[PDB]
Design a protein around this nucleic acid. Structure first.
Ligand SMILES: [Mg+2]
Ligand SMILES: [Mg+2]
Ligand SMILES: [Mg+2]
Ligand SMILES: [Mg+2]
Ligand SMILES: [Mg+2]
Ligand SMILES: [Mg+2]
Ligand SMILES: [Mg+2]
Ligand SMILES: [Mg+2]
Ligand SMILES: [Mg+2]
Ligand SMILES: [Mg+2]
Ligand SMILES: [Mg+2]
Ligand SMILES: [Mg+2]
Ligand SMILES: [Mg+2]
Ligand SMILES: [Mg+2]
Ligand SMILES: [Mg+2]
Ligand SMILES: [Mg+2]
Ligand SMILES: [Mg+2]
Ligand SMILES: [Mg+2]
Ligand SMILES: [Mg+2]
Ligand SMILES: [Mg+2]
Ligand SMILES: [Mg+2]
Ligand SMILES: [Mg+2]
Ligand SMILES: [Mg+2]
Ligand SMILES: [Mg+2]
Ligand SMILES: [Mg+2]
Ligand SMILES: [Mg+2]
Ligand SMILES: [Mg+2]
Ligand SMILES: [Mg+2]
Ligand SMILES: [Mg+2]
Ligand SMILES: [Mg+2]
Ligand SMILES: [Mg+2]
Ligand SMILES: [Mg+2]
Ligand SMILES: [Mg+2]
Ligand SMILES: [Mg+2]
Ligand SMILES: [Mg+2]
Ligand SMILES: [Mg+2]
Ligand SMILES: [Mg+2]
Ligand SMILES: [Mg+2]
Ligand SMILES: [Mg+2]
Ligand SMILES: [Mg+2]
Ligand SMILES: [Mg+2]
Ligand SMILES: [Mg+2]
Ligand SMILES: [Mg+2]
Ligand SMILES: [Mg+2]
Ligand SMILES: [Mg+2]
Ligand SMILES: [Mg+2]
Ligand SMILES: [Mg+2]
Ligand SMILES: [Mg+2]
Ligand SMILES: [Mg+2]
Ligand SMILES: [Mg+2]
Ligand SMILES: [Mg+2]
Ligand SMILES: [Mg+2]
Ligand SMILES: [Mg+2]
Ligand SMILES: [Mg+2]
Ligand SMILES: [Mg+2]
Ligand SMILES: [Mg+2]
Ligand SMILES: [Mg+2]
Ligand SMILES: [Mg+2]
Ligand SMILES: [Mg+2]
Ligand SMILES: [Mg+2]
Ligand SMILES: [Mg+2]
Ligand SMILES: [Mg+2]
Ligand SMILES: [Mg+2]
Ligand SMILES: [Mg+2]
Ligand SMILES: [Mg+2]
Ligand SMILES: [Mg+2]
Ligand SMILES: [Mg+2]
Ligand SMILES: [Mg+2]
Ligand SMILES: [Mg+2]
Ligand SMILES: [Mg+2]
Ligand SMILES: [Mg+2]
Ligand SMILES: [Mg+2]
Ligand SMILES: [Mg+2]
Ligand SMILES: [Mg+2]
Ligand SMILES: [Mg+2]
Ligand SMILES: [Mg+2]
Ligand SMILES: [Mg+2]
Ligand SMILES: [Mg+2]
Ligand SMILES: [Mg+2]
Ligand SMILES: [Mg+2]
Ligand SMILES: [Mg+2]
Ligand SMILES: [Mg+2]
Ligand SMILES: [Mg+2]
Ligand SMILES: [Mg+2]
Ligand SMILES: [Mg+2]
Ligand SMILES: [Mg+2]
Ligand SMILES: [Mg+2]
Ligand SMILES: [Mg+2]
Lengths: 113, 61, 200, 85
RNA sequence: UUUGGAGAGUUUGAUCCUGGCUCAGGACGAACGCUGGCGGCGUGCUUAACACAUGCAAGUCGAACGGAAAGGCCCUUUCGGGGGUACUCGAGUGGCGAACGGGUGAGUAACACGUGGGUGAUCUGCCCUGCACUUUGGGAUAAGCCUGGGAAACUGGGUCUAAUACCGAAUACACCCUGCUGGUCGCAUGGCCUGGUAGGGGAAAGCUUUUGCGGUGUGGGAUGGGCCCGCGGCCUAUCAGCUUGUUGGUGGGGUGAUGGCCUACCAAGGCGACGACGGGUAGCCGGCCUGAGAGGGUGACCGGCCACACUGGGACUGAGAUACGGCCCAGACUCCUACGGGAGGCAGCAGUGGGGAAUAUUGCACAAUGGGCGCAAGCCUGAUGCAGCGACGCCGCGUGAGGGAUGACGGCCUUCGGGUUGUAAACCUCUUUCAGCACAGACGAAGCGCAAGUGACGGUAUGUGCAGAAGAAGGACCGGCCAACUACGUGCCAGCAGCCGCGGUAAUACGUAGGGUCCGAGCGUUGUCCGGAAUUACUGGGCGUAAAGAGCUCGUAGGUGGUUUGUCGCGUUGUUCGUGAAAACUCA
């Protein structure tokens, strides 16, 4: 009865969550078999990262992900990829790239001079 | 065990509450434990203004 | 917890001027107090103590701050003295002082603590703020219109701005490019003695 | 015995334990019936007795009274006994 | 092919050697005295495995059944209430959960733990994926009603009822046994080829009309486990022999499993100075501290295993039991008691009595995650998520600044010239961080439901305005080790002290004043562990006079060995593969 669980790591004001495959009788922060993904709620991009191949293998061998893990699977594209109904679509949004410090410095120098 | 009495004055007598610590005195042979100054029934010495925290006396006003 | 007492007394006691505009020091170079003229036995401990006191009380830094500065410098791959002096100069107060926007370390530290400057467009108010290579420091309009800041920027005729520091315009923008070298810093006193003592 | 859940579990345990004891008594009766049959040294009476015993043990394994491996090993023991003797 | 070792004081008229003692650093699950503004982060019974008031810490299904005590609707009403509805459900049968989760370290010198394998000798519900299916008959009872003891819990007797509850029979040849009969392997029996052949036997329950779940036997996954093995890891001969199922083998019993595991019959042995049996201490590991290194101490939190639930025995359940809020028995304690008889185990979350130096509030929520039940909605969760108290430890910020005099009061010295606190201060200006008063006000929730909503934290955090330098600093030391001195008061009295050692009238060492040094919201004292300690010296040392060749011989176990030839690959060395979880330390 293996189910994918979220392990509470990080800091109180901005929690950090991993995505782990482990037995249902293990701990929230204890025994783990593999580390496959993560979740970042503090960043409003809401960065999502997951190993598609490992997730697919676990779903095939018969994992029973919980509701939040299944929601993350929909968000990334893994659940609908497995089911094959709509296909493979990526709803994830990447973090906005930070403008380069070098170009910021160049613009500032140009403005100054 | 033995017990040493620091300060220029004291009010200790038979059947009195005492708190002690460890400290060697060269002159007298067998004393190694010193009575804390200004605790329980023992009060701090008077006319003390400097080196005050060691002997436990209140600050002047 | 900053230092409130006199700034001239430390210079008088340690025998070398610090601010450089101290008239009382040159007036009475002898140690202050009732028996400053008395000879003092020379000792390596005395020498090391005087050097470290000079450095710490001249830069106004706190003792534990200096201690972990030293530990970080020692852990740094480069030579401990160079790392220590570079990280110590990296302090924003000294950065602005050598940029010439400030006339004294105490007033510079107060200005930084109150936070009249802008760091990368975000207001930061930390007197011991870490400043790294290739950074940008900005100035707020509430500081530009401030009277003493105007006096400093229109009377900046102090010692020349070092190599790693340079001002670009009237906005008083300070930039750092490369890693200072002991020789081109040419800071007074010596660091070998201090590092030896802290190794002791 | 503090709350309704565990008192009910108690009740059920004792009841179905009475049932369990009855069934185990039946199995043990079959076992020693075979024991004294072998001791006497019967052949056809032993044949039908062991047929009944195997039936009972198989049914017990089916309804979970005894481990099916336990029943199989017991049956193999009966076979070895009847063939040696 | 890279990383790193410091000393000082102390025996003598003066010198050296060995060697003892003390100090300069780091750390705490800390305590004490004094002081004490704010924000952020972790942590809080090491003693009595002492005794415990109290409130909670495990329930869910009408889509299983009999039914309606309390609700809703529709029939009715005299407002006592009379019928159906399953929306809803008290209690009762029937499934599942309940060995999960959470605490502690008395017992152990042991496979218990890590490490690497074996299991041809092993089992395994709930999941997934295949194969053939899933006939029939019957008794009984809870419940409800009548009734007895009795305040009590609970209990005896009579009547009565349904189910997936219980019990016969329908096949099953993918299953299990016994007799006869072929190929491979070696790990030896014997295993495998689902080898082949003759005989024997092996079970089911329906509901629902909806994102459907169930019932029997067999093949494979994945987790879950069970047994065993080589190596490792305290002290102690002022503990020399121990053992009779003890050692080895044959027939039976037994469990799932091979097995002196047990029984009956045979043989007398096995382990022992390469430390048995005894005595003392103690849970173990990833780690932490110290240390360049080897080395030494330690098991905080967190992470993985072992064992325990007042003490001592026993057994059933189940796929699973040291069965902490399951059961039977023996002892101590407590409570109710109408004196007929009953009720109890906070080393679970809070809290009470004692211990000591000490360790907390009888606080708020399922808002996110995990777990349990049900098709789902839905229900429980002292797990978990948060708040309050403790300067216990870690990080950060505040109590101002520019100019201001050969330097205004007051104080102490003075050689009576004069110097000190002092750029300090009064002063002219400044923005005033955080507190203070108002406004807005979060993410944490692409989440839950087919509802129309959903944040305990918190109206905190965080931004936008208002007033004012307006509210904010103390503790040790100043003979040398050991950064820092003057005056005054009593002098072998009163007193200081980590070592050297300081007072017998002119003390920079006692007490008080000024001045200085150190630290800083912390400052000092105590305790513990490492270092310097080459002061247990394998890497690092000695034994003539400083501690040390037994008063001399003979001789067992071991260590060790002259020169050469062949062979083995045990020691040694090279290459490659598996593993060394997470967390931990370093680099970016
Ligand atoms: Mg996010
Ligand atoms: Mg009997
Ligand atoms: Mg049958
Ligand atoms: Mg190194
Ligand atoms: Mg001497
Ligand atoms: Mg002498
Ligand atoms: Mg020696
Ligand atoms: Mg020596
Ligand atoms: Mg206080
Ligand atoms: Mg902040
Ligand atoms: Mg705390
Ligand atoms: Mg209670
Ligand atoms: Mg239930
Ligand atoms: Mg009910
Ligand atoms: Mg069910
Ligand atoms: Mg358990
Ligand atoms: Mg169970
Ligand atoms: Mg546990
Ligand atoms: Mg404890
Ligand atoms: Mg113990
Ligand atoms: Mg016991
Ligand atoms: Mg023993
Ligand atoms: Mg083992
Ligand atoms: Mg183990
Ligand atoms: Mg009944
Ligand atoms: Mg019926
Ligand atoms: Mg049945
Ligand atoms: Mg076959
Ligand atoms: Mg058959
Ligand atoms: Mg049949
Ligand atoms: Mg049937
Ligand atoms: Mg299968
Ligand atoms: Mg299988
Ligand atoms: Mg295993
Ligand atoms: Mg082994
Ligand atoms: Mg070992
Ligand atoms: Mg034996
Ligand atoms: Mg015998
Ligand atoms: Mg057996
Ligand atoms: Mg035997
Ligand atoms: Mg280290
Ligand atoms: Mg080590
Ligand atoms: Mg140990
Ligand atoms: Mg422990
Ligand atoms: Mg642990
Ligand atoms: Mg017990
Ligand atoms: Mg107890
Ligand atoms: Mg006990
Ligand atoms: Mg069983
Ligand atoms: Mg089970
Ligand atoms: Mg239980
Ligand atoms: Mg309890
Ligand atoms: Mg408690
Ligand atoms: Mg007490
Ligand atoms: Mg949860
Ligand atoms: Mg959940
Ligand atoms: Mg749902
Ligand atoms: Mg509840
Ligand atoms: Mg509740
Ligand atoms: Mg605090
Ligand atoms: Mg405290
Ligand atoms: Mg405390
Ligand atoms: Mg000033
Ligand atoms: Mg603020
Ligand atoms: Mg949110
Ligand atoms: Mg969001
Ligand atoms: Mg002195
Ligand atoms: Mg001196
Ligand atoms: Mg004194
Ligand atoms: Mg003193
Ligand atoms: Mg005098
Ligand atoms: Mg002073
Ligand atoms: Mg601080
Ligand atoms: Mg060493
Ligand atoms: Mg050292
Ligand atoms: Mg050593
Ligand atoms: Mg020592
Ligand atoms: Mg010799
Ligand atoms: Mg001799
Ligand atoms: Mg001899
Ligand atoms: Mg001799
Ligand atoms: Mg000999
Ligand atoms: Mg010999
Ligand atoms: Mg030999
Ligand atoms: Mg030789
Ligand atoms: Mg070899
Ligand atoms: Mg690892
Ligand atoms: Mg690391």
């Amino acid at each position: 009865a293996v189910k994918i669980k979220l392990t509470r790591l990080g800091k109180i004001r901005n929690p950090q969550y991993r995505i782990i495959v482990a037995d249902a009788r293990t701990r929230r922060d204890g025994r783990a078999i593999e580390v496959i993904g993560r979740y970042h709620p503090k960043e409003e991009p809401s960065l999502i990262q997951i190993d598609s191949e490992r997730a697919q293998y676990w779903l095939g061998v018969g994992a029973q992900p919980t509701e939040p893990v299944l929601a993350l699977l929909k968000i990334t594209g893994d659940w609908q990829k497995f089911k094959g109904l709509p296909g493979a679509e990526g709803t994830l949004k990447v973090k906005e790239p930070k403008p380069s410090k070098l170009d910021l410095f160049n613009a500032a120098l140009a403005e100054a001079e | 065990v033995t017990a040493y009495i620091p300060g220029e004055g004291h009010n200790l007598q038979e059947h009195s509450m005492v708190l002690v610590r460890g400290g060697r005195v060269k002159d007298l042979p067998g004393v190694r434990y010193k009575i804390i100054r200004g605790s329980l029934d023992t009060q701090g010495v008077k006319n003390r203004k400097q080196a005050r925290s060691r002997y436990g006396a209140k600050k002047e006003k | 917890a900053r230092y409130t007492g006199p700034a001239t007394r430390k210079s008088r006691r340690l025998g070398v001027d610090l601010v450089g505009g101290d008239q009382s020091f040159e007036k009475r170079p002898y140690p202050p107090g009732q028996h400053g003229r008395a000879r003092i036995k020379e000792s390596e401990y005395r020498q090391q103590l005087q050097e470290k006191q000079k450095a710490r009380f001249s830069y106004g830094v706190m003792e534990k701050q200096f201690r972990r500065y030293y530990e970080e410098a020692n852990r740094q791959p480069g030579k401990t003295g160079d790392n220590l002096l570079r990280i110590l100069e990296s302090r924003l107060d000294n950065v602005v002082y050598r940029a010439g926007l400030a006339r004294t370390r105490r007033m510079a530290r107060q200005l930084v603590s109150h936070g009249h400057f802008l760091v990368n467009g975000v207001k930061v108010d930390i007197p011991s703020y870490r400043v790294s290579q290739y950074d940008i420091i900005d100035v707020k309009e509430k500081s530009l219109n401030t009277l003493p800041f105007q006096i400093a920027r229109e009377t900046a005729g102090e010692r020349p701005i070092p190599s790693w520091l340079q001002v670009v315009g009237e906005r008083q923008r300070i930039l750092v490019h490369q890693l200072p070298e002991r020789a081109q810093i040419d800071v007074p006193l010596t660091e070998q003695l201090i590092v030896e003592l802290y190794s002791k | 015995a503090n709350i309704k859940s565990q008192i009910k579990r108690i009740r059920t345990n004792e009841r179905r334990r009475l049932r369990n004891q009855s069934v185990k008594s039946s199995l043990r009766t079959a076992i020693r019936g075979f024991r004294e049959a072998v001791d006497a040294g019967d052949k056809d009476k032993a044949s039908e007795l062991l047929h009944a015993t195997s039936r009972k043990l198989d049914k017990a394994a089916s309804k979970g009274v005894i481990h099916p491996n336990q029943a199989a090993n017991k049956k193999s023991a009966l076979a070895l006994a009847l063939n040696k003797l």
